[PDB]
Amino acid sequence: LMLCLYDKVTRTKARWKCSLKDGVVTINRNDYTFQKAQVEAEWV
Amino acid sequence: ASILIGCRRAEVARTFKEIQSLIHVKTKEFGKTLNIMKNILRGKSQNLTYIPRFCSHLGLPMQVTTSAEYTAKKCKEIKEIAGKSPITIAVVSIYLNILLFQIPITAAKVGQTLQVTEGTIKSGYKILYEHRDKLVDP
């Protein structure tokens, strides 16, 4: 669970790029505190 | 749009921007209601003139247009619908003629006078550099 705040997410029906700012990322027991994150995900 | 209907009927024409910036109606409903006027015209019943006006503001001799007109005629007939709103390639007819002659009017000056993005200028110029071989009149 990445409890962050979004800024601008761009998508054309098959892909996600999730802008994240002033939030945290929780992976492998180490928290990732980031200024700006862009989740360039893909949609099935 | 009545002026457009007027001026076109007056056997001249100006680009939409020259009128859209003259009268800003957001250009969307403007053209949409403009089209039905032709249908009403038909119910109640063209770049060829854009040539000399374009070279007019830049002050050149008279032989450019027909030389440009010959080039303008050749593009559409074989292929190259070229524009989808082909108003863009009206200038493309002209620029490959100013590229011919040595007067420096590079797309910097055309881009501020005729107001065409070099994305359209350079793309249209080079795809017309492919077929310029059959374009040697004199």
């Binding site: - | 001249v12 003139t49 000399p52 006006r53 007019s56």
Partner: protein, 74 residues
């Protein structure tokens, strides 16, 4: 200096001889610099007929031979 905006929209220098024949008006435009201010470049305003042989006319100081070229009697 005098000129004429023709039907298409082209604007070229007008010569007095042409003016009489083509029923034109031997005029020239006026242009004013305008300064706009918001408180808490060059602007065309109109034409102006020009007296023939005035200081601004093309015939202002032309040569006698040049006048013959322009088909205007000295």
């Amino acid at each position: 200096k005098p000129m004429v905006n023709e039907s298409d929209g082209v604007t070229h220098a007008l010569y007095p001889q042409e003016a009489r024949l083509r029923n034109l008006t031997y005029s020239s435009g006026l242009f004013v610099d305008v300064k706009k201010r918001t408180y808490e470049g060059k602007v065309f305003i109109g034409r102006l007929p020009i007296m023939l042989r005035s200081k601004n006319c093309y015939l202002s100081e032309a040569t006698e031979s040049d006048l013959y070229k322009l088909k205007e009697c000295p």
